[PDB]
């Protein structure tokens, strides 16, 4: 290697003078720019619409944290054009020159990291060390996939040798494709879904959640600065079901790399099989479609050690992520020590604008407030309502922490994403009957288990099947790397992130034979 | 990786009716184009000139077996500007690339192992063995070399780490280089000396000896055939004086890799070091200068064994060998038994045209003739003649096996390289005074000893000074791959052919940091 | 490995109190010792002579810094004997012993670091800085060699098996040879040049430069001290064009390491050449001989980054670096941004007695003095002045940092090494004509591109033709194992210091095979 070791990037906690001196000016200065627009980025030229996609703060709804461009079909094919132009030399440079490329790109995210931060704290409403971790784990994407990509280097497949000939096998990139994101990880996942592709010479054309337009928009200009060629990466902010569906359906698209909702999810996997008029290839779908997590608590673990990771994990930005415990299985023996751990924990979280660094701050959007609402409603007719339930006063989405208990395993609250602060208990005789009950529901991404009983967390390692699973510890906050991210059954096609196999997937082998 | 691991090609021995089949045909074929020219071969194509050179069957000198184009210096001029021109690209090439040219090559000289073993008989005089040793060596080169040089591939260099940089070394070619060669092993030497700077980005210049110059033509046919860009290698065959040492002197000259006489290769590397009018570098010269070697025998050997090795050592292609056992010494316990085995071998040997395959072929030209007779001569006045010593009857240069003993080590012709069938028998105390002098000479290439006693073969691994020394066998016959090939002292600079080694040797390193 | 990893020590900054302290009192001791003399070491013990050389202070050459003896003829025959008879046995120590010794030696050196920067700072006028960055070099030279070396350990060469016979190819020093150093890194490359051969069995003979003799007498306390045996490393201060030219063109010196100004170079190359009256080897000569180079900067580079690296660059200790830069180029759009950030940086830079730590000390000596000066007046011929070009008032040899702009390609200060705090600016149209200027001079050490434009930058990694390349960054301070140092043309034989590679330069091969 020609660099050093890899090591994930360090989560700032805030707990300095310095560091919170260096926040407190980041949130300012992107305060103070409110309101302005970003456009399009469309082979290496940023370029405007007449309409517009606005972007508010979810802790004060009336104001815009900015805008940017509108992309329709026409700027899809635009951005289309571009991408498989660009396609024809970036798939020829050395693999050395590409993974440089992600290493600037790396070093100019981690000089504007308080500045990203910030960003995240107004537009998706994440508290400081939320807001910290995204931005960490998109400068881990860049670091990792820049050195992972140089395994795959020409020519890197084993093969068996010939007699009078020369066998070479060697890895080559797809063409261009579509990455499509969401909004709880506007900078992370961005980042992670575009530049793997990218490393190994793949060109693509990214569309941002419509609620985290504008993080995209600051992301983009970290490619530019870096340099990343004309038509390589393409920012196309717009709605999802419009220019998102177009390109997916697209002929010309030769692959489609998404994270969101299972809904979605099934319906890019769905349209993905079809071969579209003239088109001529097989389309490759990655999809990372959330879950339904639970951590599993039996008598014998450390009660105070297990409330808190699971009101870490429950409760961290505000429940919206695809790795937060929703459900909390608890054995006969430790259902009352741990229920009452949790709930005092719990009571104490605060909730606020998240620029002040609250616990947890309002959720994304109206919508995604009407929605957890709602699956609260459903909640009070299925399970026992211990704790919120409600909205908080305020123009932002607040929504307090809730917790239902005695919820039957096949409850709706206790199947359905709902990906807000809510949490399921769900009572159980013992360990086996708590992987029963882990076990059934459509979905497999996280999991966890608090025990002290070695037999039960090996039986678990074995058993609990989660593509991510935790013992004695929060089940969110994967590092890339470290822990490879990806599902099971509905979370998914287990495409894992921060892994090495990740990138095999945006490469297919060629095999040339020479006789002599 | 891509290829069967390096294996030796197998030697010959024509021990099958249909070996000795096609070695006859091979003969006929080979006589019967007596009568060609070869061209010269300049970016590309066969250039013919004014002059010319001839080449005589040393067997029977009367008869012609072809005839080149003679290069003056415009012509050394025009192969000049065509490697210069070539480099510019090839120095490009990937090495993967590069390295099957060159594997591509080796199977068109495998396809074309008897024509060429039947060349050498007929041009140089070597028996079927001894011809089919350096085919089969010539093969070797390419084989190996092809596969060495991609250890070197870019980036190659282990470097040490630093925080936010990328630390890259590489290895790149030198540039156009000339290669002046042996007429004693005029295919292999002439191979490898070319392949080896050659299969890693460089471009060559080839000259070959005045007395195998029709042999040499072929190889480049091989190398035409193969598909080397234009002016990637340039066939130059001339006078040695004229057009090697107008070259050597040459401001834009990057490199000289030279096999022959001391004489000639002092003043090659004298000129080397100096810096020509307009010159803009310091020129590398590579120069490997023959020897003096010994055989020690002490008196726990198997004299049978040893006599045996000795005769093939000394007399092997008649003695015309840098690594030829051209003295013997023998301690007092052994010098007898060794001697007497010796004699009774060597009268046995037969001498006459080598296209018959006798034990002994002629020496390669009336110059070498006299060269050799001149050294008997001076024998006779410092040792004891005790067998062979004369010409043979006929017009070829046949000289027969001669022994000369009681021969003072300080003697001039246990000093000087006389490069034909004299071995001169040195009768020393122990082994401690054996190795005293075969270490007091000028040179320091071959040698070895027969012996039983553990202590005395490893103390001549840590003290008998040769580059190559062997134990209980033959000093002849360096494998590629299995023997580093060079030696120390006025044997030349240590330029290991067959080796990874060898490969360095046309490189230079680049390091390239990137501060991002 | 029985040690840690290898890690460059760390250049002082002297921010913090303890280490300004701590350089104070090494500052005030040293200063406390002008005047000391130290005899020649030969043989294991220190031997004084008659005459002397002395060495002043730069900042103030009414000063004595110390005195040594004077090496004549007589002295350089005792110190040959010495060297070739502790080879003998040397030679023979298991690797590990050698390598142990040299780490016991850096870490000797490493406690006494303040002394030997401090002696930097008085004798050849280092800021503190520059002082601790040499002495830090050296330290690396001996931690790093003494690792490379056991991978060149009995027995290492990776050879091809052979039926019934043990074939092992192992390294083997080369003898005793002579070490010529420069005095503007007379601790580091001083040191580099001579454990490097040493740690792999040779033995040397050291000859610092005029300049800087007292600090390579306090070397070799290090040396003693750690208790190479007698003969081993052998110091002999004294005329370059008398004991060393001597020693060069011995017949009994096997080789020679050598780091200077282009003229010796090209000298002792030749001479090296040349086969000495009953000499028995080819001489190996490495030489490092300068180089003159540029720094490119375009109009996508980040201007304030690049004046402060090209500052650093062309003025760091004196410009006294065979890796400053001296030339300027700037493509059209970048001329002026650029010109007048260096002016105004360069306008700020302190110049006065190396003690006081200012941006620039003095040159060396009166004769570097009149070198620099001579140079600036060739320049108001040739270039636009329009910094500096001035001698500063007082006794020491002070010069002004000095800019000449509007510098043809070819003028003299455009092409010859004046090694002064001289730069030459040169506007060229675009990158290409940039890369043009910058590879047309005899040399090819080190060169810099400040750009942000990835094209610009791969397109230099493979075509700005110097050893030792650096993007966005000062091109001088190359760091041992980091960058492997060393360039191309002109500027030497591109022997890579602090790189594996190096090693291999001072041993040869040998190949011993039994059959069984
Ligand atoms: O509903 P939701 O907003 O919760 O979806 P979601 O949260 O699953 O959407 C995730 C991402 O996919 C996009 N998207 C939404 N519907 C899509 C569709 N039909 N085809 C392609 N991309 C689509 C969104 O714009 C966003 O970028
Ligand atoms: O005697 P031998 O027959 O062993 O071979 P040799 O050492 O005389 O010559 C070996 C090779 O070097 C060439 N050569 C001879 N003299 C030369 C010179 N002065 N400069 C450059 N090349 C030269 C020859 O033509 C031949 O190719
Ligand atoms: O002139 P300069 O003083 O600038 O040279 P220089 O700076 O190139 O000298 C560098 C080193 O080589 C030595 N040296 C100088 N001339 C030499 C010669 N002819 N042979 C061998 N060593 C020599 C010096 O004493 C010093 O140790
Ligand atoms: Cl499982
Ligand atoms: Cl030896
Ligand atoms: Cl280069």
Redesign the interface.
Request: proline content about 19%; charged content about 30%.
């Given at each position: 290697?020609?660099?050093?070791?890899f090591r994930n990037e360090p989560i700032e906690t805030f707990q300095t003078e310095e560091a919170r001196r260096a926040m407190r000016e980041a949130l300012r200065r992107v305060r103070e720019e409110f309101g302005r627009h970003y456009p399009l980025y469309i082979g290496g030229e940023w370029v405007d619409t007449k309409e517009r996609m606005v972007s508010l703060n979810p802790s004060a709804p009336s104001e815009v944290v900015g805008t940017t461009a509108k992309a329709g079909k026409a700027e899809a094919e635009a951005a289309l054009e571009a991408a498989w132009k660009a396609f024809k030399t970036w798939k020829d440079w050395?693999q050395?020159?590409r993974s440089?490329?992600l290493?600037?790109a790396?070093?100019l995210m981690r000089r504007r990291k308080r500045e990203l931060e910030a960003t995240l704290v107004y537009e998706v409403g994440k508290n400081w060390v939320e807001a910290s971790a995204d931005v960490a784990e998109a400068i881990d994407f860049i670091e990792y996939y820049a050195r992972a990509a140089l395994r795959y280097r020409?020519?890197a497949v084993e093969?068996v040798?010939?007699?009078?000939?020369?066998?070479?096998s060697f890895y080559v990139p797809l063409g261009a494709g579509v990455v499509i994101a969401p909004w709880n990880f506007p900078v992370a996942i961005f980042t992670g879904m575009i530049v793997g592709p990218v490393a190994v010479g793949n060109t693509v054309i990214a569309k941002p959640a419509e609620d985290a337009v504008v993080v995209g928009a600051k992301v983009f200009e970290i490619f530019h600065?870096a340099?990343?060629?004309p038509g390589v990466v393409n920012f196309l902010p717009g709605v999802g079901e419009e220019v998102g569906a177009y390109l997916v359906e697209h002929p010309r698209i030769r692959f489609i790399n998404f994270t969101g909702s299972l809904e979605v999810g099934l319906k890019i996997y769905e349209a993905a099989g079809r071969l579209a008029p003239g088109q001529t290839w097989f389309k490759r779908a990655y999809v990372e479609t959330g879950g339904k997590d639970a951590i599993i608590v039996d008598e014998t673990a450390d009660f105070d050690l297990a409330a808190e990771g699971v009101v870490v994990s429950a409760y961290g930005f505000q429940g919206q992520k695809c790795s937060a415990a929703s459900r909390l299985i608890l054995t006969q023996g430790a259902y009352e020590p741990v229920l009452e751990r949790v709930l005092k924990r719990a009571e104490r979280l605060s909730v606020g604008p998240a620029e002040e660094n609250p616990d947890l701050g309002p959720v994304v959007s109206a919508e995604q407030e009407r929605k957890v609402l709602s699956y609260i409603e459903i909640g009070k007719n299925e399970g026992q309502l211990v704790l919120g339930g409600k909205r908080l006063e305020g123009e932002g989405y607040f929504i307090a922490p809730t917790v239902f208990t005695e919820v039957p395993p096949k409850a709706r609250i206790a199947q359905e994403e709902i990906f807000g602060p809510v949490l399921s208990v769900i009572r159980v005789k013992d360990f086996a009957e708590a992987l029963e009950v882990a076990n059934d529901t459509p979905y497999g991404l996280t999991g966890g288990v608090y025990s002290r009983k070695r037999e039960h967390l090996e039986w678990a390692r074995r058993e609990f099947h989660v593509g991510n699973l935790y013992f004695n510890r929060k089940i969110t906050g994967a590092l890339v790397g470290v822990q490879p991210f990806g599902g099971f059954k509905l979370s998914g096609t287990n495409a894992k992130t921060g892994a090495l196999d990740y990138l095999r997937l945006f490469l297919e082998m060629k095999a040339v034979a020479?006789r002599?």
């Open positions: 290697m020609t660099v050093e070791p050395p050395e020159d440089r490329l290493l600037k790396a070093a020409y020519p093969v040798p010939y007699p009078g000939e020369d066998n070479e600065e340099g990343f060629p020479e002599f």
